[PDB]
Amino acid sequence: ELSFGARAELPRIHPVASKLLRLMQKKETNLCLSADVSLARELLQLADALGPSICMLKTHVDILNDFTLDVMKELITLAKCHEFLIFEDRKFADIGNTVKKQYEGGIFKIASWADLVNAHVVPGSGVVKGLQEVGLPLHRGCLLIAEMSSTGSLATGDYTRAAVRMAEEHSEFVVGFISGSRVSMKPEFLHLTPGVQLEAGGDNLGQQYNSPQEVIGKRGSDIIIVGRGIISAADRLEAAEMYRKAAWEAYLSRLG
Amino acid sequence: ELSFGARAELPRIHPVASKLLRLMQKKETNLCLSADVSLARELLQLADALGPSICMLKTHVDILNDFTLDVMKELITLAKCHEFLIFEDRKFADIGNTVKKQYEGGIFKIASWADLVNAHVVPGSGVVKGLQEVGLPLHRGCLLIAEMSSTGSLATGDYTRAAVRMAEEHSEFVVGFISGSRVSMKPEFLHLTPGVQLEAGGDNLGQQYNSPQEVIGKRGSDIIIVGRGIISAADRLEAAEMYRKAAWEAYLSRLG
Ligand SMILES: NC(=S)c1cc(=O)[nH]c(=O)n1[C@@H]1O[C@H](COP(=O)(O)O)[C@@H](O)[C@H]1O
Ligand SMILES: NC(=S)c1cc(=O)[nH]c(=O)n1[C@@H]1O[C@H](COP(=O)(O)O)[C@@H](O)[C@H]1O
Ligand code: PRO
Ligand code: PRO
């Protein structure tokens, strides 16, 4: 097993994965903030204050009540200042012809500001081929949803294996996974894991939580994605630091 | 097998399904236009001209370059005038807590104007439970994606069976499926089938086409969803009429 800094230099590394792995190693963070907020001001205040603690900020542009492209300009300024990537959690999930238009166009112009997006693999590889027609010219990357954290997830067994094959066959654009565990044996791929809290439990709508130690240390993932464990806390900076230190130490201990 | 008009009266029918089945029978149309356009003016001009020919207009609000809620007000006026439902093809596809916010909120306020939305079943039943917390109070309906038209689709076998079970267990909100065929034996559920053209073929990004006769007549679906077969034609009204007559006669012949 290689450090994040060494993985950043692998021959087959994607440039977006390399940038991410280098800033993870530099900043000692493998935390992705899930900024599930409805106000641009709260999104930007979280990005500014927590930027030093995170490798990545995951957005849901479609729940911002006051989305504009200027908000995303201000977010990019903070991402460059504090050195983190922007990941729009769009879950592209249809035929290639449709997702190509959804990625480039409409009011959000996601490809113009998102370093990373994700896709469900259920439509077959056309979902990746369509996105890559927009994303490759713009030097973007994509994550494939290989496993899900929620009760009754169908992203298991042969579905997960199909996601891994699709990623490994589209390595010029696919840089990793949303997963609960290491699913690819190839170190060039990032594993990002949502469904993470320090305390045991879940929510009222099928979310299930595992700890940073469990998902980074035992399950071999690279990055934790944390929403409410941070966002609902009073001091979101302290909460982000607790999650960062948990995920980072779990990574160091596994690396040995 | 019951006519659309008789299915509209079934004891367990959802009110949105009943409204749809009644206007299908009244207008002799089982055609859903896939209005995959980037200009509000083109969306509204298609909705006005093709409204009499369609039971439903399927939107992708996120590819409209000039989306506003006023555009959706104008679309509702046309839907009421010409009697068709509005189906936003949002493909909700995450944990219940997230999709609840995506359905109600952000710039699109989808629940405020969409009679129908759809969801992928990959997250497990929490995707339906989250959407229904917004959709049930607003008397809306949902379609579950049980099969997909594209090459390499993973919506097969046990995945399709899980979608059918999830629909049948959430009948207060789920009114049917996106599928290639009849997948539920319960006549209260609608089957809507995309990947439809009069001519054989596909696209360059994994879309595959079957004819209205094949999917309504042989595969037992209720409604065809047609995009480019209409949208790319010079005379979109004539094209819509050809697809309407094809789907309607296939339905009549199967009913006997
Ligand atoms: N789309 C992805 S990254 C995803 C996949 C998954 O399996 N489980 C997921 O919780 N997520 C997302 O991660 C976030 C988890 O938030 P929280 O439960 O920590 O508050 C949320 O935005 C959800 O949409
Ligand atoms: N999301 C759904 S309804 C879907 C599921 C599926 O399996 N195949 C799909 O083509 N669709 C959608 O139907 C439309 C087909 O357009 P066309 O190929 O007729 O031009 C398009 O908007 C696509 O996103
Ligand atoms: O010097 C560095 O940071 C990188 C890490 C692995 C080797 N070179
Ligand atoms: O009269 C009608 O239109 C409906 C159709 C089935 C029975 N009643």
Side-chain angles (χ1 to χ4, degrees), chain A residues 153-199:
Chain A
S153 172
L154 304 175
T156 65
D158 286 356
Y159 186 106
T160 303
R161 287 187 276 278
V164 172
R165 179 181 345 111
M166 193 178 301
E168 293 181 351
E169 293 184 350
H170 291 95
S171 72
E172 69 198 311
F173 182 55
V174 176
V175 304
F177 305 94
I178 306 303
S179 60
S181 65
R182 183 173 305 200
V183 291
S184 175
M185 305 299 295
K186 296 185 186 294
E188 296 78 15
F189 293 92
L190 274 298
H191 296 100
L192 290 74
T193 299
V196 173
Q197 281 206 194
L198 297 180
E199 299 285 8

Short mmCIF file of all heavy atoms in Angstrom, two decimals, chain A residues 153-199:
data_model
loop_
_atom_site.label_atom_id
_atom_site.label_comp_id
_atom_site.label_asym_id
_atom_site.label_seq_id
_atom_site.Cartn_x
_atom_site.Cartn_y
_atom_site.Cartn_z
N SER A 153 -30.25 -0.97 -0.14
CA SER A 153 -29.40 -0.70 -1.31
C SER A 153 -29.34 -1.93 -2.22
O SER A 153 -29.04 -3.03 -1.75
CB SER A 153 -28.02 -0.31 -0.90
OG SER A 153 -27.18 -0.23 -2.05
N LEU A 154 -29.52 -1.72 -3.52
CA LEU A 154 -29.36 -2.79 -4.53
C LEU A 154 -27.96 -2.73 -5.16
O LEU A 154 -27.69 -3.53 -6.06
CB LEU A 154 -30.44 -2.62 -5.60
CG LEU A 154 -31.87 -2.61 -5.07
CD1 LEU A 154 -32.86 -2.31 -6.18
CD2 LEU A 154 -32.22 -3.92 -4.39
N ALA A 155 -27.10 -1.83 -4.70
CA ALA A 155 -25.73 -1.69 -5.26
C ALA A 155 -24.82 -2.68 -4.55
O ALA A 155 -23.94 -2.28 -3.77
CB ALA A 155 -25.26 -0.27 -5.17
N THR A 156 -25.03 -3.96 -4.85
CA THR A 156 -24.34 -5.09 -4.19
C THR A 156 -23.94 -6.11 -5.25
O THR A 156 -24.47 -6.08 -6.37
CB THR A 156 -25.24 -5.72 -3.12
OG1 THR A 156 -26.37 -6.29 -3.80
CG2 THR A 156 -25.69 -4.74 -2.06
N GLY A 157 -23.06 -7.04 -4.87
CA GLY A 157 -22.76 -8.22 -5.70
C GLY A 157 -22.39 -7.84 -7.12
O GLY A 157 -21.46 -7.04 -7.31
N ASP A 158 -23.10 -8.38 -8.11
CA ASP A 158 -22.75 -8.19 -9.54
C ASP A 158 -22.90 -6.72 -9.94
O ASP A 158 -22.21 -6.29 -10.87
CB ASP A 158 -23.59 -9.10 -10.43
CG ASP A 158 -23.22 -10.57 -10.39
OD1 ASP A 158 -22.22 -10.93 -9.72
OD2 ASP A 158 -23.91 -11.35 -11.06
N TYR A 159 -23.75 -5.96 -9.26
CA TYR A 159 -23.95 -4.52 -9.56
C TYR A 159 -22.65 -3.78 -9.23
O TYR A 159 -22.13 -3.01 -10.04
CB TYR A 159 -25.16 -3.99 -8.80
CG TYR A 159 -25.54 -2.57 -9.13
CD1 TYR A 159 -26.64 -2.29 -9.92
CD2 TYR A 159 -24.81 -1.50 -8.65
CE1 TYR A 159 -27.00 -0.98 -10.22
CE2 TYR A 159 -25.15 -0.20 -8.93
CZ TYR A 159 -26.26 0.07 -9.72
OH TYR A 159 -26.61 1.35 -10.04
N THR A 160 -22.12 -4.03 -8.04
CA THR A 160 -20.84 -3.43 -7.60
C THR A 160 -19.72 -3.86 -8.56
O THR A 160 -18.92 -3.01 -8.96
CB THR A 160 -20.53 -3.85 -6.16
OG1 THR A 160 -21.63 -3.46 -5.33
CG2 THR A 160 -19.22 -3.26 -5.67
N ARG A 161 -19.67 -5.14 -8.93
CA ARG A 161 -18.62 -5.63 -9.86
C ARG A 161 -18.74 -4.90 -11.21
O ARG A 161 -17.70 -4.54 -11.78
CB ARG A 161 -18.70 -7.15 -9.99
CG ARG A 161 -18.20 -7.87 -8.76
CD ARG A 161 -18.12 -9.38 -8.95
NE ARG A 161 -19.40 -10.01 -8.69
CZ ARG A 161 -19.88 -10.32 -7.49
NH1 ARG A 161 -19.17 -10.07 -6.39
NH2 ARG A 161 -21.07 -10.87 -7.38
N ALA A 162 -19.95 -4.64 -11.68
CA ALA A 162 -20.17 -3.93 -12.96
C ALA A 162 -19.66 -2.49 -12.82
O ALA A 162 -19.07 -1.98 -13.77
CB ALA A 162 -21.62 -3.96 -13.34
N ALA A 163 -19.88 -1.86 -11.67
CA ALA A 163 -19.40 -0.47 -11.47
C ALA A 163 -17.87 -0.45 -11.53
O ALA A 163 -17.29 0.48 -12.12
CB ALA A 163 -19.88 0.06 -10.15
N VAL A 164 -17.23 -1.43 -10.89
CA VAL A 164 -15.74 -1.48 -10.87
C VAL A 164 -15.23 -1.68 -12.30
O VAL A 164 -14.27 -0.98 -12.70
CB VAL A 164 -15.23 -2.57 -9.91
CG1 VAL A 164 -13.73 -2.76 -10.05
CG2 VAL A 164 -15.60 -2.23 -8.48
N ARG A 165 -15.81 -2.61 -13.06
CA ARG A 165 -15.38 -2.86 -14.46
C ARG A 165 -15.57 -1.58 -15.28
O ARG A 165 -14.68 -1.21 -16.06
CB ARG A 165 -16.17 -4.02 -15.06
CG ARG A 165 -15.83 -4.36 -16.50
CD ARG A 165 -16.68 -5.51 -17.01
NE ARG A 165 -17.37 -6.22 -15.93
CZ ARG A 165 -18.69 -6.23 -15.67
NH1 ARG A 165 -19.55 -5.58 -16.45
NH2 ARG A 165 -19.14 -6.91 -14.62
N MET A 166 -16.70 -0.91 -15.13
CA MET A 166 -16.99 0.31 -15.92
C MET A 166 -15.94 1.39 -15.61
O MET A 166 -15.46 2.06 -16.54
CB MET A 166 -18.40 0.80 -15.59
CG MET A 166 -18.92 1.83 -16.52
SD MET A 166 -20.60 2.34 -16.12
CE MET A 166 -21.43 0.77 -16.24
N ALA A 167 -15.58 1.55 -14.34
CA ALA A 167 -14.54 2.53 -13.93
C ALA A 167 -13.20 2.16 -14.57
O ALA A 167 -12.53 3.01 -15.17
CB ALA A 167 -14.42 2.55 -12.44
N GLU A 168 -12.81 0.90 -14.42
CA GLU A 168 -11.46 0.45 -14.82
C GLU A 168 -11.36 0.54 -16.35
O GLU A 168 -10.24 0.79 -16.84
CB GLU A 168 -11.18 -0.93 -14.20
CG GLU A 168 -11.07 -0.89 -12.67
CD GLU A 168 -10.76 -2.22 -12.01
OE1 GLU A 168 -10.78 -3.26 -12.71
OE2 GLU A 168 -10.50 -2.21 -10.77
N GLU A 169 -12.47 0.43 -17.08
CA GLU A 169 -12.50 0.49 -18.57
C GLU A 169 -12.63 1.93 -19.07
O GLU A 169 -12.56 2.14 -20.29
CB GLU A 169 -13.61 -0.41 -19.10
CG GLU A 169 -13.34 -1.88 -18.84
CD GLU A 169 -14.34 -2.86 -19.42
OE1 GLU A 169 -15.41 -2.41 -19.89
OE2 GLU A 169 -14.04 -4.07 -19.42
N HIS A 170 -12.82 2.91 -18.18
CA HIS A 170 -12.99 4.34 -18.54
C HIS A 170 -12.11 5.20 -17.65
O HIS A 170 -12.54 6.26 -17.18
CB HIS A 170 -14.47 4.73 -18.45
CG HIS A 170 -15.26 4.08 -19.52
ND1 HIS A 170 -15.94 2.89 -19.33
CD2 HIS A 170 -15.40 4.38 -20.83
CE1 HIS A 170 -16.50 2.53 -20.46
NE2 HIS A 170 -16.20 3.43 -21.39
N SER A 171 -10.86 4.76 -17.47
CA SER A 171 -9.91 5.37 -16.51
C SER A 171 -9.47 6.77 -16.97
O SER A 171 -8.91 7.50 -16.15
CB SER A 171 -8.74 4.46 -16.29
OG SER A 171 -7.89 4.41 -17.43
N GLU A 172 -9.69 7.14 -18.23
CA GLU A 172 -9.34 8.51 -18.70
C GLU A 172 -10.28 9.54 -18.08
O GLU A 172 -9.95 10.73 -18.11
CB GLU A 172 -9.35 8.59 -20.23
CG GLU A 172 -10.72 8.46 -20.86
CD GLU A 172 -10.71 8.11 -22.34
OE1 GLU A 172 -9.97 8.77 -23.09
OE2 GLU A 172 -11.44 7.18 -22.73
N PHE A 173 -11.42 9.10 -17.53
CA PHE A 173 -12.43 10.05 -16.98
C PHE A 173 -12.88 9.65 -15.58
O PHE A 173 -13.14 10.54 -14.76
CB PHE A 173 -13.61 10.13 -17.94
CG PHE A 173 -14.68 11.11 -17.52
CD1 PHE A 173 -14.37 12.43 -17.25
CD2 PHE A 173 -16.00 10.70 -17.37
CE1 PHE A 173 -15.35 13.32 -16.85
CE2 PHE A 173 -16.98 11.60 -17.00
CZ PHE A 173 -16.65 12.90 -16.72
N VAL A 174 -13.03 8.35 -15.33
CA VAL A 174 -13.50 7.86 -14.01
C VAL A 174 -12.29 7.76 -13.09
O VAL A 174 -11.34 7.04 -13.41
CB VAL A 174 -14.23 6.52 -14.12
CG1 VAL A 174 -14.60 6.01 -12.74
CG2 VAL A 174 -15.46 6.65 -15.00
N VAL A 175 -12.36 8.44 -11.95
CA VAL A 175 -11.22 8.54 -11.01
C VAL A 175 -11.50 7.78 -9.73
O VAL A 175 -10.60 7.71 -8.89
CB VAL A 175 -10.87 10.01 -10.73
CG1 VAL A 175 -10.59 10.75 -12.01
CG2 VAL A 175 -11.94 10.69 -9.92
N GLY A 176 -12.69 7.23 -9.57
CA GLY A 176 -12.97 6.49 -8.34
C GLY A 176 -14.44 6.23 -8.15
O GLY A 176 -15.22 6.26 -9.13
N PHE A 177 -14.77 5.97 -6.91
CA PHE A 177 -16.08 5.42 -6.52
C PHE A 177 -16.66 6.17 -5.35
O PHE A 177 -15.93 6.60 -4.46
CB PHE A 177 -15.93 3.96 -6.11
CG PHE A 177 -15.28 3.12 -7.17
CD1 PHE A 177 -13.91 2.89 -7.16
CD2 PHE A 177 -16.02 2.65 -8.24
CE1 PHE A 177 -13.31 2.17 -8.18
CE2 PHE A 177 -15.43 1.91 -9.25
CZ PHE A 177 -14.07 1.68 -9.22
N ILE A 178 -17.98 6.18 -5.32
CA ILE A 178 -18.75 6.23 -4.06
C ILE A 178 -18.96 4.78 -3.66
O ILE A 178 -19.57 4.01 -4.43
CB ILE A 178 -20.07 6.99 -4.24
CG1 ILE A 178 -19.88 8.39 -4.83
CG2 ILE A 178 -20.83 7.03 -2.92
CD1 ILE A 178 -18.96 9.29 -4.03
N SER A 179 -18.49 4.40 -2.48
CA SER A 179 -18.58 3.00 -2.03
C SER A 179 -18.52 2.97 -0.51
O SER A 179 -18.19 3.99 0.08
CB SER A 179 -17.51 2.16 -2.65
OG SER A 179 -16.22 2.63 -2.31
N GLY A 180 -18.81 1.82 0.08
CA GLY A 180 -18.71 1.66 1.54
C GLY A 180 -17.36 1.12 1.96
O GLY A 180 -17.07 1.11 3.15
N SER A 181 -16.56 0.71 0.99
CA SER A 181 -15.33 -0.08 1.19
C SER A 181 -14.44 0.07 -0.04
O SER A 181 -14.92 0.54 -1.07
CB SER A 181 -15.70 -1.52 1.38
OG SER A 181 -16.29 -2.01 0.18
N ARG A 182 -13.20 -0.38 0.07
CA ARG A 182 -12.36 -0.59 -1.13
C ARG A 182 -13.08 -1.60 -2.03
O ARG A 182 -13.38 -2.71 -1.55
CB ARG A 182 -11.00 -1.10 -0.67
CG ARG A 182 -9.99 -1.31 -1.79
CD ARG A 182 -8.63 -1.66 -1.20
NE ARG A 182 -8.18 -0.64 -0.24
CZ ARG A 182 -6.93 -0.44 0.15
NH1 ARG A 182 -5.94 -1.18 -0.32
NH2 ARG A 182 -6.67 0.52 1.02
N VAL A 183 -13.39 -1.23 -3.27
CA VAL A 183 -14.02 -2.15 -4.26
C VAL A 183 -13.08 -2.42 -5.44
O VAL A 183 -13.22 -3.48 -6.04
CB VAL A 183 -15.39 -1.62 -4.73
CG1 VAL A 183 -16.41 -1.69 -3.62
CG2 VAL A 183 -15.33 -0.23 -5.32
N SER A 184 -12.18 -1.50 -5.77
CA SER A 184 -11.13 -1.72 -6.80
C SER A 184 -9.80 -2.03 -6.11
O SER A 184 -9.46 -1.37 -5.10
CB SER A 184 -10.96 -0.55 -7.71
OG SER A 184 -9.87 -0.77 -8.61
N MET A 185 -9.06 -2.98 -6.67
CA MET A 185 -7.70 -3.35 -6.21
C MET A 185 -6.66 -2.44 -6.86
O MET A 185 -5.47 -2.59 -6.56
CB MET A 185 -7.42 -4.82 -6.56
CG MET A 185 -8.47 -5.77 -6.02
SD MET A 185 -8.59 -5.73 -4.21
CE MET A 185 -6.98 -6.36 -3.77
N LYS A 186 -7.08 -1.53 -7.74
CA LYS A 186 -6.14 -0.65 -8.48
C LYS A 186 -5.98 0.65 -7.69
O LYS A 186 -6.96 1.35 -7.46
CB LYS A 186 -6.67 -0.40 -9.89
CG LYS A 186 -6.75 -1.65 -10.76
CD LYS A 186 -7.16 -1.35 -12.19
CE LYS A 186 -7.38 -2.61 -13.01
NZ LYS A 186 -6.13 -3.38 -13.19
N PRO A 187 -4.75 1.00 -7.25
CA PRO A 187 -4.56 2.12 -6.33
C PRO A 187 -4.77 3.51 -6.94
O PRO A 187 -4.81 4.48 -6.21
CB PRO A 187 -3.12 1.94 -5.84
CG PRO A 187 -2.44 1.26 -6.99
CD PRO A 187 -3.48 0.30 -7.53
N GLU A 188 -4.90 3.59 -8.26
CA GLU A 188 -5.16 4.85 -9.00
C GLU A 188 -6.58 5.35 -8.73
O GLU A 188 -6.85 6.53 -9.01
CB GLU A 188 -5.05 4.61 -10.50
CG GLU A 188 -3.66 4.20 -10.95
CD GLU A 188 -3.27 2.75 -10.69
OE1 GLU A 188 -4.18 1.93 -10.41
OE2 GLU A 188 -2.06 2.44 -10.77
N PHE A 189 -7.46 4.48 -8.24
CA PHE A 189 -8.87 4.85 -8.01
C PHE A 189 -9.07 5.29 -6.57
O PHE A 189 -8.56 4.68 -5.62
CB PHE A 189 -9.81 3.70 -8.38
CG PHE A 189 -9.80 3.45 -9.86
CD1 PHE A 189 -8.93 2.53 -10.40
CD2 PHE A 189 -10.56 4.21 -10.73
CE1 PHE A 189 -8.85 2.33 -11.77
CE2 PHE A 189 -10.49 4.01 -12.10
CZ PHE A 189 -9.64 3.06 -12.62
N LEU A 190 -9.81 6.39 -6.40
CA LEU A 190 -10.22 6.88 -5.06
C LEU A 190 -11.50 6.17 -4.62
O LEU A 190 -12.42 5.97 -5.43
CB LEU A 190 -10.47 8.40 -5.07
CG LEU A 190 -9.26 9.31 -4.84
CD1 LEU A 190 -8.61 9.10 -3.48
CD2 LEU A 190 -8.23 9.14 -5.94
N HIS A 191 -11.58 5.89 -3.32
CA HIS A 191 -12.80 5.38 -2.67
C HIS A 191 -13.31 6.44 -1.70
O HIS A 191 -12.60 6.77 -0.74
CB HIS A 191 -12.52 4.06 -1.98
CG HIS A 191 -12.14 2.97 -2.92
ND1 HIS A 191 -10.83 2.58 -3.13
CD2 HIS A 191 -12.90 2.17 -3.70
CE1 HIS A 191 -10.83 1.58 -4.01
NE2 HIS A 191 -12.08 1.32 -4.36
N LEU A 192 -14.51 6.96 -1.96
CA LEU A 192 -15.16 7.95 -1.08
C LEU A 192 -16.38 7.30 -0.45
O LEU A 192 -17.21 6.74 -1.18
CB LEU A 192 -15.61 9.19 -1.85
CG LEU A 192 -14.55 10.13 -2.39
CD1 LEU A 192 -13.83 9.56 -3.60
CD2 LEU A 192 -15.17 11.47 -2.74
N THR A 193 -16.51 7.42 0.87
CA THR A 193 -17.55 6.71 1.62
C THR A 193 -18.43 7.67 2.39
O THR A 193 -17.97 8.31 3.35
CB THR A 193 -16.93 5.69 2.58
OG1 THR A 193 -16.22 4.75 1.77
CG2 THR A 193 -17.98 4.99 3.41
N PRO A 194 -19.72 7.77 2.02
CA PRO A 194 -20.73 8.47 2.81
C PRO A 194 -21.36 7.50 3.82
O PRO A 194 -21.02 6.31 3.84
CB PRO A 194 -21.73 8.90 1.75
CG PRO A 194 -21.75 7.70 0.81
CD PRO A 194 -20.32 7.17 0.82
N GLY A 195 -22.31 7.99 4.60
CA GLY A 195 -22.88 7.20 5.70
C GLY A 195 -21.90 7.10 6.86
O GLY A 195 -21.68 6.00 7.37
N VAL A 196 -21.34 8.24 7.25
CA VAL A 196 -20.27 8.26 8.28
C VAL A 196 -20.67 9.20 9.42
O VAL A 196 -21.00 10.35 9.17
CB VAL A 196 -18.93 8.67 7.67
CG1 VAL A 196 -17.86 8.88 8.74
CG2 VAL A 196 -18.47 7.66 6.64
N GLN A 197 -20.59 8.69 10.65
CA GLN A 197 -20.70 9.50 11.88
C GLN A 197 -19.81 8.87 12.95
O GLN A 197 -19.53 7.66 12.86
CB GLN A 197 -22.15 9.66 12.36
CG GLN A 197 -22.89 10.73 11.56
CD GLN A 197 -24.06 11.47 12.17
OE1 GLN A 197 -24.82 12.15 11.45
NE2 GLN A 197 -24.20 11.42 13.48
N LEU A 198 -19.41 9.65 13.94
CA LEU A 198 -18.61 9.10 15.06
C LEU A 198 -19.48 8.16 15.90
O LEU A 198 -18.95 7.14 16.35
CB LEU A 198 -18.08 10.25 15.91
CG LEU A 198 -17.12 11.20 15.21
CD1 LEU A 198 -16.66 12.28 16.17
CD2 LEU A 198 -15.92 10.46 14.63
N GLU A 199 -20.75 8.50 16.11
CA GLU A 199 -21.68 7.69 16.92
C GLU A 199 -22.45 6.72 16.03
O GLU A 199 -22.70 7.04 14.85
CB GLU A 199 -22.68 8.57 17.67
CG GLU A 199 -22.03 9.54 18.64
CD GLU A 199 -21.51 8.94 19.94
OE1 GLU A 199 -21.50 7.70 20.07
OE2 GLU A 199 -21.11 9.74 20.82
#
